[PDB]
Design a protein around this ligand. Sequence first.
Ligand SMILES: COC(=O)Nc1ccc2c(c1)N[C@@H](C(=O)OC)CCCC[C@H](NC(=O)/C=C/c1cc(Cl)ccc1-n1cnnn1)c1ncc-2[nH]1
Length: 238
Amino acid sequence: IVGGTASVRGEWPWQVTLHTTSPTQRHLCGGSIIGNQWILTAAHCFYGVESPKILRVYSGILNQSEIKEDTSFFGVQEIIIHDQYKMAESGYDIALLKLETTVGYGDSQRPICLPSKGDRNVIYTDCWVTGWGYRKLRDKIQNTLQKAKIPLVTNEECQKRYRGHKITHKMICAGYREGGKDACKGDSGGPLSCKHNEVWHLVGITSWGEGCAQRERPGVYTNVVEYVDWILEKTQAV
Ligand SMILES: COC(=O)Nc1ccc2c(c1)N[C@@H](C(=O)OC)CCCC[C@H](NC(=O)/C=C/c1cc(Cl)ccc1-n1cnnn1)c1ncc-2[nH]1
């Protein structure tokens, strides 16, 4: 996260750190708890990931230093990638992780509500992007979870900012015209969380951008409201 500040423990209890074991263990992506065995993240995170056996989901983490060999994690049973996904810049950048075991909810780890189909007609004015990603293009994974409040941008304005791309309504953008606050490398898959009528909603999944926090280059997020039926299809399968 660029232009952010340190989060407080338990502030974003749905935020997870997804680690990979190949070749050595490291943070791979962010993610969000959406159900007791479901993590919602970005499909692009799994580029070259051949098996779910190399993945480790850590919840209830403020600092990466809490993770050692003795730290408990959730194993991944299945990686579910939207089958229209080609690349982040083309959309459908959404994946589900089915956990091998159930998440026990508490003040340290709990689910974020998905947006309502009725909430498609709402204006969110309190949106935050979180993650352990870089503070600048050439940086390193941060120890402490960072947060940054960023305004949502209309599809029209975001299309103006990305000549040469097709910004669809399945994407949602967020950023300041002057830049300065944004997601960056290592933040992808994580949530764009918006508070509405005292309830937090998973409005976006950190996807892509041209550089980090640049003027007139908003961050592009998977517009979660447009995938509610897809998530329910995968998680409520008979
Ligand atoms: C010690 O641990 C370690 O250093 N881990 C680690 C470090 C960096 C990475 C990463 C893991 N993730 C990628 C990876 O592991 O590649 C091998 C996969 C995932 C590859 C893509 C990912 N994209 C983002 O995260 C966000 C982009 C993005 C999103 C918005 Cl909304 C706005 C601007 C953006 N940026 C434009 N340019 N940069 N950001 C990423 N790129 C490097 C990484 N992630």
